[PDB]
Amino acid sequence: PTSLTNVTIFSPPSDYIVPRTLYPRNEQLPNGDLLATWENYSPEPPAVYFPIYRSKDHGKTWNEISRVHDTVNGYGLRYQPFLYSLPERVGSFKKGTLLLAGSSIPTDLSSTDIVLYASQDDGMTWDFVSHIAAGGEARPNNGLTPVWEPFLLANKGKLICYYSDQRDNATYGQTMVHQVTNDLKNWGPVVEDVTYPTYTDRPGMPVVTKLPNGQYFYVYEYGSFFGTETYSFPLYYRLSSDPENIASAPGQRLVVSSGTQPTSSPYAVWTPYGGENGTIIVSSGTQGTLFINKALGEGEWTEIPCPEEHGYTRALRVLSEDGGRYLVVNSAGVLLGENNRVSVSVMDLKEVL
Numbered sequence: 001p002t003s004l005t006n007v008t009i010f011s012p013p014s015d016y017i018v019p020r021t022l023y024p025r026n027e028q029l030p031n032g033d034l035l036a037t038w039e040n041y042s043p044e045p046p047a048v049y050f051p052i053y054r055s056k057d058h059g060k061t062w063n064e065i066s067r068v069h070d071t072v073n074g075y076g077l078r079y080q081p082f083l084y085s086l087p088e089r090v091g092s093f094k095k096g097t098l099l100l101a102g103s104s105i106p107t108d109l110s111s112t113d114i115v116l117y118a119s120q121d122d123g124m125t126w127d128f129v130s131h132i133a134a135g136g137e138a139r140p141n142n143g144l145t146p147v148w149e150p151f152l153l154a155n156k157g158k159l160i161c162y163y164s165d166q167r168d169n170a171t172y173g174q175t176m177v178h179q180v181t182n183d184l185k186n187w188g189p190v191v192e193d194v195t196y197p198t199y200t201d202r203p204g205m206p207v208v209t210k211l212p213n214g215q216y217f218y219v220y221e222y223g224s225f226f227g228t229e230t231y232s233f234p235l236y237y238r239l240s241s242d243p244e245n246i247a248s249a250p251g252q253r254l255v256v257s258s259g260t261q262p263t264s265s266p267y268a269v270w271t272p273y274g275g276e277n278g279t280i281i282v283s284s285g286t287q288g289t290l291f292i293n294k295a296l297g298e299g300e301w302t303e304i305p306c307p308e309e310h311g312y313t314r315a316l317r318v319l320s321e322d323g324g325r326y327l328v329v330n331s332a333g334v335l336l337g338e339n340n341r342v343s344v345s346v347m348d349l350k351e352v353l
């Protein structure tokens with residue numbers, strides 16, 4: 001791999017509906033290949049789908065290889081995809097099964113349904129596996145009951161899906177929860193992970209990375225007034241050595257040594273590079289810079305430059321090559337953006353950390 005800046009993965013046609021693209025996610029397969037997807041706002045009919053683009057040259061070039069269509073509901077695979085190569089067998093699904101979770105939503109935004117698709121051929125073909133969780137109207141307004149934003153993580157022969165939940169609307173504006181499965185087909189009950197006692201609080205957008213000492217770093221945006229007249233979405237994290245037990249961990253506000261106060265739509269990864277504990281690397285949806293921590297989340301975070309533009313839920317990935325040396329930074333644009341595109345940069349962590 002090499003450093004790359006602002007490589008275009010996909011530039012949408014003008015006749016796509018603003019924002020055209022949004023919500024980048026990616027995966028690196030064990031052979032090193034990179035896959036990228038996003039919310040793809042094509043005119044309907046036919047129903048929207050999640051495109052799957054591949055790079056076999058470490059991000060220099062990209063080609064579409066498949067599309068994940070809404071074969072289960074016919075509504076459209078519309079919001080909040082997530083790619084995940086199983087690192088171990090789960091039930092009848094071998095290590096290396098490639099999963100996509102994402103939300104099936106009709107054009108009228110009347111419902112949400114986080115569904116799970118699987119590919120056994122590295123993303124060439126897909127089959128529906130199960131519904132994870134379904135809810136109400138796909139708008140982020142209090143009183144509504146949607147589900148949103150799946151994040152997948154396997155541990156001990158199980159798959160965990162973390163997501164944002166508005167269904168407990170009598171008590172919370174939004175929470176974050178998870179469900180667990182040992183077979184990809186049958187899901188256990190909803191477990192509340194992050195709840196707050198002020199109704200107008202809206203924690204959201206969970207992303208997890210495992211640290212080398214066995215702790216899990218669970219990052220989220222914490223929407224709140226914090227007792228003022230102004231709402232904000234500062235980044236918070238929780239630390240737990242049990243990835244199914246988040247509720248018992250107190251939230252910790254991410255503090256940056258420069259004074260930047262990062263907000264919205266976090267992403268977190270970990271590399272062995274940078275020191276004896278490696279480095280946690282965090283993005284927000286508002287800042288173009290990155291935030292790093294060489295002490296497992298202790299102390300304050302260091303803001304560093306980044307050549308990739310800022311974007312909503314900008315996605316990070318530490319590539320495996322050279323023991324975690326290169327970082328993918330992948331944007332699909334901004335909310336309601338008039339000129340969104342899907343792009344990627346690669347940074348050399350040997351130099352930038």
Ligand SMILES: OC[C@@H]1O[C@@H](OC[C@@H]2O[C@@H](O)[C@H](O)[C@H]2O)[C@H](O)[C@H]1O
Nearest residue numbers: 023079080139140148164203204205
């Ligand atoms: O991904 C498309 C995007 O989702 C909807 O917002 C959901 C909202 O986003 C986070 O801030 C919260 O966790 C969740 O409630 C938008 O309407 C749509 O553009």
